[PDB]
Design a protein around this ligand. Structure first.
Ligand SMILES: Cc1nc(C)c(C(=O)Nc2ccc(F)c(-c3nc4ncc(-c5ncccc5C)cn4n3)c2)o1
Ligand SMILES: *[B]([O])([O])[C]([C][C]([C])[C])[N]C(=O)[C]([C]C1=[C][C]=[C][C]=[C]1)[N]C(=O)C1=[C]N=[C][C]=N1
Ligand SMILES: *[B]([O])([O])[C]([C][C]([C])[C])[N]C(=O)[C]([C]C1=[C][C]=[C][C]=[C]1)[N]C(=O)C1=[C]N=[C][C]=N1
Ligand SMILES: *[B]([O])([O])[C]([C][C]([C])[C])[N]C(=O)[C]([C]C1=[C][C]=[C][C]=[C]1)[N]C(=O)C1=[C]N=[C][C]=N1
Ligand SMILES: *[B]([O])([O])[C]([C][C]([C])[C])[N]C(=O)[C]([C]C1=[C][C]=[C][C]=[C]1)[N]C(=O)C1=[C]N=[C][C]=N1
Lengths: 229, 219, 201, 214, 206, 204, 218, 123, 229
């Protein structure tokens, strides 16, 4: 699982892969780790597939019962204190890394990263999942803050594609959605139209010369591809 | 243990404490931890008193035996190689952390040997249990090309960070200066903990303990 | 701890040591191993020092509340059954206590023994503790029912002593009581080192 | 994570004919570091005539000092202002250590006070409340240094000599300084400065004393 | 440990007694098995333990005393020389491949002057031993479960000047206490004695 | 533990021109007394007296290897062994068996016959050399002896008044230890004589 | 998420407290831009070494206690010695419930001259000194803080107590793995608690014994 | 549950629910017991010779202990519940004290149950 | 530890940090993980500081005894089969990740990566150490093969600096050396002249707004920096 959420001027861009894998076997290759809480507030979802699904639909029922009694819109800081309350009083029993990102008219675009420990940190961009450790040095070099909506979509799709190329846990589709003052626009690009893959990376075309022919010199001349020559 | 070392302008200065404890009680208060290796090489030691003394005397007799053959002054890099191959081939069972200092024709050589067998050649090293508290004094006040007096006081002020803060260390500062020509070993250089309130000396007269038999054997 | 008490023609004599050790360190040397419950009962202590001094203080409270309500003395068959029902109720709670109760009720004497597991036995001759196994062999050799009052005090003081001399967990000051029909009296209280130069001069 | 931790230090007391001297060094330390050198939380006052002097774990020490503090106050409110004696406090201590027997305190206690007659008596406790009245007592990490030392010079045993007269407050105080200057030499978890409390019938006087800093 | 060995020395004799019980975890195999091995004409050892190492230790000790009398022209060694040879075999076996001997034994003997130049020990000898290799010369020694019952019995009643009959009725008290308190059924005790005329098998006390 | 299986405490103090050494008399198996009249001291010559504590099987086996090596030293070298040579000899014996180690803790006391300097040494079970100038002590009551010896010692003691301090230190520490006691056997030794004293103790 | 070492010292007039602005997760340094110095009420401030989720719930609790006692009633604000006492009894309550607040904390506070400096552990230990350090600053930085309080018993001024914290934060960057060179310093004085803008220290890496040919193992 | 206070005080210091419970006994069957030197006799009224009652003779005086027996007067349904509390108390006593229960002990228990129903809600 | 070796046309560029750390404490902050075997063949050195030092000077004595008996130059493939032989027959007892890179006149610049398992793979660039997992997605995006010698030095110094900014195990100096047909040129740039650090990264200047002032609205207005305001 590689999940991330990046803020721009208008709102936020949620990004995630699509694969639940029982250790080493792909149980599902079209998962949806972008969970709707309210219309403009979603959450990314990593870790245990059952422990985080039960939290996401328990928060989303407190959060819709709140919205009816208030009669107004729900702030993102409200939804991020319902995950922190539940991920802290269950922190020894669940495995839950949650990234809460959304839009509210008061504060604009907000990103909250709630790790497995149960803390809450408000950010500009957040990373999560087992594939997130590849993306710290990728965002230190290639990420500049203050992009547009069209640039954050193509960046976060290029960000996830570098993550599941090296990670074995992550893979599949790339599901992204933007949350701002307009309608929430979702987009799912496949594997075969992904912006990066190592199989078509032109520097991994040459095989590593392991299987040397039996020869008279120490001059390395590539692999042995035939029984005759 | 709070053994340290410092490279100064011409030579090295080795430092140590004197406390030796066997299981939360102070066994000895004036143990000696700066050992002899060569006329130009000394060696501090931490860990177990059995393993430190027996790795040092074996190598220091091997360096002496190798000195009669060559007829030359012994290198500190060959003192280090004999220590690191012994401590590696027992795989950390010989629990001795070492600080090795010396002077050769190539200049001062200060390096440490871990109990697993790894070596680090640095301008200043600390080993033992109070090595963390003694390093913070060295990281705050070391500079290149210090005099013999400024390095002897920097070493002694780093031992007292292990005396007054580490419970496994104390009671004195041992300082050994290694030069190209001579080598000076002082034991009572800094005794910050003196004897406060000298003893009442409860007097018992000779004969007040009841004795059942006694046998006197003249010589 | 070595602790014995025996029953004979004339009452019950209780004899104990006074030593409490935490493994190889001796904590104290003046421990009262006999908690007198009231002026006609006794109770000894062996095993855990706090487990005994708590529940024999609870036992001394249930014996005093018996006399307040029912207007008469408690028997010894009811006094141990209070201590045995308490002990059996906490048999899985890791208690370590082995106690004898001794007293003169209206049916003569009776000498019982309560485990830390809820047992209660009725004999005329016990010896409890870690050094009890030394106190049996010198007592079973010289015990008989019709001993005199002075000789049974001598046999009890001498049987504790040979256990304190051999066991590392026993020693100190040998305390001998005597339970007659009017209650109990402290017979003697003497050091074990002074008692060595009497029995082997 | 383990919920028990030994914080060093030692406490010793020697009781006289109408006084007790009560001492305990001021040194707090943890895993391998040294937390403080000035902790006064080792000897606690319950009544003007009876103190408690405990050591071991510093966290369960402060909890036991407060539950002892308010059971004395419910005693004072329910008895018409009558202050509890040493014998009443030290049996209160012996019961509360057994009420928490299965999740106990990691403290080792001494209740130190005067009698109803005026004589001083010190008590000692294990982790579960084994009490005994006695004339002195030494707890802590340096107990095995000092408790054999107090056996040799207070009891006056194994010495074929006549008995000295009764010890004053000054000769007891100078004796007890020889133990803490002896425990500061040979115990690594003991000794920065020891605070002496002298409990007499006309109030309490308080002194301090300097030990070795290493 | 289920079977006891009781031995005490006096002015001119050494009593030994060893219960002849052999069991299989609760089942009495025997009741009369001799566990007091006659090493020499004036020396014997009362080993306790299971029957595996007990025979194989005593046969190694006995055949080496006899071999040391073959090679030394029939000269009987002292009791301390036999006892120090025994604990050498206990102490070298706790640091070996095969493991420690699980035997607890009491060595007993009488020292006679082998020639006119011998001015050594004249009296009796009694040595406490252990499975580790502890050796201690002792006035009386005991092993087994009933050892602590009878060691404090011999604290009460043993005297250095006991006669052959007074120590015979003392050993009868030693055997009747083990029958009284020990749960392990020791009914037959094999009392032997070492005197100046050799060993003798006492029939009366059992 | 294996080290406190047999019981017994041996200590030694250093004086002006003398030293003392003193052991208890108990042998045991973890609670029960096996013997009441067994010392732990050994004398090899008129200058060196050493005491062993720990496991009694190792207390006798190691002391046989020492006597095998001390008497072989006197046949090869035509002289008595000295204190610094004897202490450095059985330091090497406890280090050869470092992974199969002996369970002894030798307490060595020695003196120069011609010079008059005392030399104390107490190694660990793995042979850690340590020479204090004041006192050494090992055994089951060793933690009780560091309090008794350090609060009562002074450097300038006569042989008659050094015995009185070492005797009151052994007995007061054995009244708190349940694996040591039953009297004590001491040995004061000067340049001129060796005096061996047996001390009254509690029979508890 | 876990915090690093926190050091603090008293001077003539107030208390200083420094801490790096890093929140690591194991070895990974996730966020170098979060503030750890929370200030309590109007006279005090706390900072923690250990779990951040335990500190974020504990400091939320003890901040609600200061305001609601002050808002509801006509009482004064709690002193630093009384809100540290509530901080101590709340951590000890959690370990007796077998769910502790797994972090060391450093507490500072100044109320009209009376300066307060104390720390508290997850177990319930509390101590007061003129120099508190938690984490690996208790091993590294705390020996340097102790000698500079005893080389002048009259007291440190603010200028010389700021030199030695910078000398201690510099060695924490040298010798602690889970640390960065970005530090905030709280300053509790008679005016109140004031947290500074993040700064860095000047590090020296230019020794002639650190060169490639000397440290080589050929 | 239902625990409204029923047994309350009159304006003259009387308990109405106790004085009206004594009137239910004064209509009950008469039972007389006297005390001798070696024997105790108790005789009850045994309502009538109904001729329709069972030939199996029905005892009115109920057995409570091995030596302690009881006879009542009042409501015969309330007394059966009272005795099965006292027959349960004898087996509580010789399970915690190993003794035969005294006569004065059992009466202090039954009088303790009578008083406990005069100071309860809903009772 | 973050070690890497990158090939260009002439030879190779070795790059490493300088820090040996006993778990959590920096024992040495000026380590040298670039070990000389012969004049033109070095090895990077990760894992156990003692187990890899004993291998590096045991190979370097077999390799210099070979060079004297041959009378010619040592190939890099020769030196990489002496580490593979030793890291495989000791693989349960040591902890050793070795990157062997060098120069020989026959094959030019060679890079061999020998992991902890004991395998040998000939590469174009290699990564190693605990800090190497940050650099896979950094080399997938920012690395183009075929750079010059001056460009591979500034790249590998920029590569290590992104690695020890996130890694806690790695840090200190950056020691680089180039091995080609010229003399071996070494270079050690410090921390305070490193090409990247997060403390001077201009997007981590704004603190994450955690410590909100006690206010009347949900409008997030930054941290609370003073007791008065
Ligand atoms: C009818 C009868 N026949 C016998 C033979 C017994 C008997 O022995 N009953 C008994 C019951 C409960 C106990 F708890 C004990 C008991 N006594 C002790 N004394 C000393 C130590 C000790 N002291 C110091 C250090 C280490 C230890 C182990 C331990 N215990 N345990 C003994 O009862
Ligand atoms: B992602 O791989 O972490 C994913 C996130 C989930 C919330 C949709 N989790 C899973 O794939 C988990 C396994 C896992 C992998 C790595 C870390 C933690 C957990 N999958 C399952 O829990 C699972 C397995 N089998 C059946 C159903 N669900
Ligand atoms: B260091 O603490 O001064 C010291 C090293 C020197 C004496 C070789 N260590 C000791 O004091 C050791 C114990 C130890 C403590 C902490 C870490 C490792 C080892 N003491 C002894 O080895 C010892 C024991 N008995 C007598 C003499 N020395
Ligand atoms: B005797 O040794 O059994 C004695 C009797 C008791 C009434 C004083 N008991 C103890 O000495 C026990 C030994 C023990 C038995 C079982 C478990 C643990 C310990 N010691 C104590 O209880 C003790 C502990 N600390 C102080 C005093 N006593
Ligand atoms: B690097 O951090 O992996 C480094 C490589 C070494 C070959 C120079 N290793 C170390 O720092 C090791 C610890 C380690 C960290 C991470 C993975 C594996 C090992 N250091 C030591 O082995 C060490 C520790 N203390 C003293 C001496 N050496």
């Amino acid at each position: 699982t590689t999940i991330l959420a990046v803020s721009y001027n208008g709102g936020v861009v949620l990004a995630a892969d699509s694969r639940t894998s029982s250790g080493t076997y792909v149980v599902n290759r079209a998962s949806n780790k972008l969970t709707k809480l309210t219309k403009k507030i979603y959450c990314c979802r990593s870790g245990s597939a059952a422990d985080t699904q039960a939290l996401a639909e328990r928060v989303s029922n407190y959060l819709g019962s709140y919205q009816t009694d208030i009669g107004a819109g729900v702030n993102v800081a409200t939804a991020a204190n319902l995950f922190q309350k539940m991920c802290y009083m269950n922190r020894w029993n669940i495995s839950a890394g949650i990234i809460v990102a959304g839009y509210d008219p008061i504060n604009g675009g907000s990103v909250y990263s709630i790790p497995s420990g149960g803390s809450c940190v408000k950010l500009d961009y957040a990373l999560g999942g087992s594939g997130s450790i590849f993306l710290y040095s990728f965002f230190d070099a290639n990420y500049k803050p203050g992009m547009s909506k069209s640039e954050c979509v193509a960046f976060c799709q290029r960000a996830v594609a570098h993550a599941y190329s090296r990670d074995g846990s992550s893979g599949g589709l790339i599901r992204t959605i933007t949350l701002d003052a307009d309608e929430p626009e979702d987009q799912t690009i496949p594997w075969n139209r992904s912006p990066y893959c190592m199989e078509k990376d032109p520097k991994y075309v040459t095989q590593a010369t392991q299987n040397q022919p039996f020869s008279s010199s120490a001059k390395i001349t590539g692999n042995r591809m035939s029984s005759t020559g | 243990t709070t053994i340290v070392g410092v490279v100064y302008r011409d030579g090295v200065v080795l430092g140590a404490d004197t406390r030796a404890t066997e299981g939360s009680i102070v066994a000895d208060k004036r143990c000696r931890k700066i050992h002899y290796m060569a006329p130009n090489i000394m060696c501090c030691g931490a860990g177990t008193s059995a393993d430190t003394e027996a790795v040092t005397n074996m190598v220091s007799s091997h360096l002496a035996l190798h000195r009669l053959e060559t007829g030359k002054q012994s290198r500190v890099l060959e003192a280090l190689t004999l220590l690191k191959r012994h401590l590696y081939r027992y795989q950390g069972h010989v629990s001795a952390a070492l600080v090795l200092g010396g002077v050769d024709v190539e200049g001062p050589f200060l390096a440490t040997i871990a109990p697993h067998g790894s070596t680090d050649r640095l301008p200043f090293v600390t080993m033992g249990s109070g090595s963390i508290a003694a390093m913070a004094q060295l990281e705050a006040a070391y500079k290149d090309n210090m005099t013999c007096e400024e390095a002897k006081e920097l070493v002694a002020s780093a031992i007292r960070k292990g005396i007054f803060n580490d419970p496994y260390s104390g009671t004195q500062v041992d300082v050994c200066v290694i030069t190209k020509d001579k080598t000076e070993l002082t034991i009572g250089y800094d005794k910050p903990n003196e004897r406060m309130y000298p003893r009442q000396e409860v007097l018992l007269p000779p004969g007040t303990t009841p004795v059942l038999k006694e046998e006197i054997r003249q010589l | 701890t070595t602790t014995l008490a025996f029953r004979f023609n004339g009452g019950i004599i209780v004899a104990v040591d006074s030593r409490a050790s935490t493994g190889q360190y001796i904590a104290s040397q003046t421990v009262m191993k006999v908690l007198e419950i009231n002026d006609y009962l006794l109770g000894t202590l062996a095993g855990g020092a706090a487990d005994c001094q708590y529940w024999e203080r609870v036992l001394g409270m249930e014996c005093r509340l018996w006399e307040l309500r029912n207007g008469s003395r408690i028997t010894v068959a009811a006094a141990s059954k209070i201590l045995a029902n308490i002990t059996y109720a906490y048999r899985n709670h890791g208690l370590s206590m082995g106690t004898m109760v001794a007293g003169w009720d209206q049916f003569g004497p009776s000498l019982y023994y309560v485990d830390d597991k809820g047992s209660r036995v009725k004999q005329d001759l016990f010896s409890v503790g870690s050094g009890s196994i030394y106190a049996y062999g010198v007592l079973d050799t010289g015990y008989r029912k019709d001993l005199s009052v002075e000789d049974a005090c001598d046999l009890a003081r001498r049987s504790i002593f040979h256990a304190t001399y051999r066991d590392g967990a026993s020693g100190g000051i040998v305390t001998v009581y005597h339970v007659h029909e009017k209650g109990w009296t402290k017979i003697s209280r003497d050091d074990q080192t002074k008692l060595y130069h009497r029995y082997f001069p | 994570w383990s919920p028990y931790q030994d914080n060093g230090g030692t406490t010793a007391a020697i009781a006289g004919k109408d006084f007790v001297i009560l001492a305990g060094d001021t040194r707090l330390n943890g895993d391998f570091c040294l937390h403080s050198r000035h902790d006064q939380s080792k000897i606690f006052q319950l009544t003007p005539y009876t103190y408690m002097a405990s050591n071991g774990m510093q966290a369960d020490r402060l909890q036991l000092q407060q539950m002892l503090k308010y059971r004395v106050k419910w005693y004072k409110y329910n008895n018409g202002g009558k202050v509890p004696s040493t014998k009443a406090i030290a049996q209160l201590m012996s019961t509360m250590l057994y009420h928490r027997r299965f999740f106990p305190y990691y403290t080792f206690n001494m209740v130190v006070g005067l009698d109803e007659e005026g004589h001083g008596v010190c008590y000692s406790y294990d982790a579960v409340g084994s009490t005994e009245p006695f004339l002195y007592g030494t707890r802590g990490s340096a107990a095995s240094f000092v408790e054999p030392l107090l056996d040799c010079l207070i009891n006056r045993q194994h010495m074929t000599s006549q008995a000295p007269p009764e010890m004053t407050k000054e000769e007891t105080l100078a004796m007890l300084k020889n133990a803490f200057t002896g425990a500061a030499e040979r115990d690594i978890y003991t000794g920065d400065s020891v605070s002496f409390f002298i409990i007499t019938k006309d109030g309490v006087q308080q002194e301090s004393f300097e030990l070795r800093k290493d | 440990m289920a079977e006891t060995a009781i031995a005490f020395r006096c002015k001119d004799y050494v009593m030994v007694a060893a219960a002849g019980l052999n069991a299989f975890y609760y089942i009495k195999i025997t009741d009369a098995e001799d566990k007091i091995t006659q090493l020499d004409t004036h020396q014997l050892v009362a080993c306790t333990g299971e029957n595996g190492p007990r025979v194989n230790f005593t046969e190694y000790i006995k055949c080496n005393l006899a071999l040391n009398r073959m090679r030394q022209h029939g000269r009987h060694s002292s009791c301390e020389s036999t006892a120090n040879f025994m604990r050498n075999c206990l102490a070298s076996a706790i640091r070996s491949r095969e493991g420690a001997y699980q035997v607890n034994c009491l060595f007993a003997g009488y020292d006679t002057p082998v020639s006119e130049d011998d001015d050594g020990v004249v009296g009796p000898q009694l040595f406490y031993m252990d499975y580790l290799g502890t050796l201690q010369a002792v006035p009386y020694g005991c092993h087994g479960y009933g050892a602590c019952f009878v060691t404090a019995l011999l604290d009460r009643l043993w005297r250095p000047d006991l006669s052959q009959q007074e120590g015979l009725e003392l050993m009868q008290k030693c055997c009747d206490e083990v029958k009284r308190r020990v749960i392990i059924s020791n009914s037959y005790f094999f009392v032997k004695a070492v005197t100046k005329n050799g060993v003798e098998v006492i029939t009366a006390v059992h | 533990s294996i080290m406190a299986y047999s019981g017994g405490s041996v200590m030694a103090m250093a004086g002006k021109e003398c030293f003392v050494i003193i052991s208890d008399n108990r042998l045991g198996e973890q609670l029960k007394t096996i013997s009441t009249e067994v010392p732990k001291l050994h004398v090899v010559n008129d200058s060196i007296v050493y005491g062993l504590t720990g496991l009694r099987t190792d207390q006798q086996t190691f002391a046989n290897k020492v006597q095998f090596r001390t008497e072989m030293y006197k046949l090869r070298e035509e002289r008595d062994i000295t204190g610094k040579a004897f202490a450095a000899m059985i330091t090497s014996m406890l280090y050869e068996a470092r992974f199969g180690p002996w369970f002894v803790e030798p307490v060595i006391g020695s003196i120069d016959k011609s010079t008059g300097e005392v030399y104390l040494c107490a190694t660990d079970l793995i042979g850690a050399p340590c020479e204090p100038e004041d006192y050494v002590c090992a055994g089951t009551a060793a933690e009780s002896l560091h309090g008794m010896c350090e609060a009562l010692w002074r450097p300038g003691m006569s042989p008659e008044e050094l015995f009185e301090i070492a005797a009151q230190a052994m007995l007061s520490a054995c009244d708190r230890d349940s694996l040591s006691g039953y009297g004590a056997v001491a040995m004061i030794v000067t340049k001129d004589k060796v005096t061996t004293r047996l001390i009254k103790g509690r029979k508890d | 998420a876990s915090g690093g070492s926190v050091i603090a010292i008293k001077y003539k007039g107030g208390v200083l407290m420094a801490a790096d602005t890093l929140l690591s997760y194991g070895s990974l340094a996730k966020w170098p831009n979060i503030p750890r110095i929370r200030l309590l009420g109007s006279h005090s401030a706390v900072c923690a070494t250990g779990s951040y989720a335990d500190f974020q719930m504990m400091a939320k609790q003890v901040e609600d206690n200061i305001e609601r006692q002050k808002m509801y009633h006509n009482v004064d604000e709690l002193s630093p010695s009384e809100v540290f006492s509530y901080l101590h009894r709340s951590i000890y309550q959690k370990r007796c419930d077998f769910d502790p607040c797994l972090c060391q904390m450093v507490f500072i506070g100044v109320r009209d001259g009376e300066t307060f400096l104390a720390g508290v552990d997850d177990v319930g230990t509390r101590w007061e000194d003129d120099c508190i350090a938690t984490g690996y600053g208790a091993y590294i930085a705390l020996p340097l803080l102790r000698q500079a309080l005893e080389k002048n018993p009259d007291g440190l001024s603010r200028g010389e107590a700021m030199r030695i914290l910078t000398d201690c934060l510099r060695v924490l960057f040298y010798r602690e793995c889970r640390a960065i060179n970005k530090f905030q310093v709280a300053d509790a004085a008679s005016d109140g608690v004031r947290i500074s803008e993040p700064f860095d220290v000047e590090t020296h890496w230019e020794y002639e014994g650190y060169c490639f040919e000397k440290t080589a193992i050929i | 549950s239902y625990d409204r206070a029923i047994t309350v005080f009159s304006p003259d210091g009387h308990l109405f629910q106790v004085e009206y419970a004594q009137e239910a006994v004064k209509k009950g069957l008469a039972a007389v017991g006297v005390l001798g030197s070696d024997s105790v006799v108790i005789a009850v009224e045994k309502k009538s010779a109904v001729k329709l009652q069972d030939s199996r003779t029905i005892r009115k005086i109920y057995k409570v202990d091995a030596n302690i027996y009881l006879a009542f007067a009042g409501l015969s349904a309330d007394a059966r519940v009272l005795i099965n509390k006292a027959q349960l108390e004898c087996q509580r006593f010789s399970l915690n004290y190993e003794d035969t229960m005294d006569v004065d002990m059992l009466v202090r228990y039954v009088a303790g149950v009578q008083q406990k129903s005069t100071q309860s809600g809903g009772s």
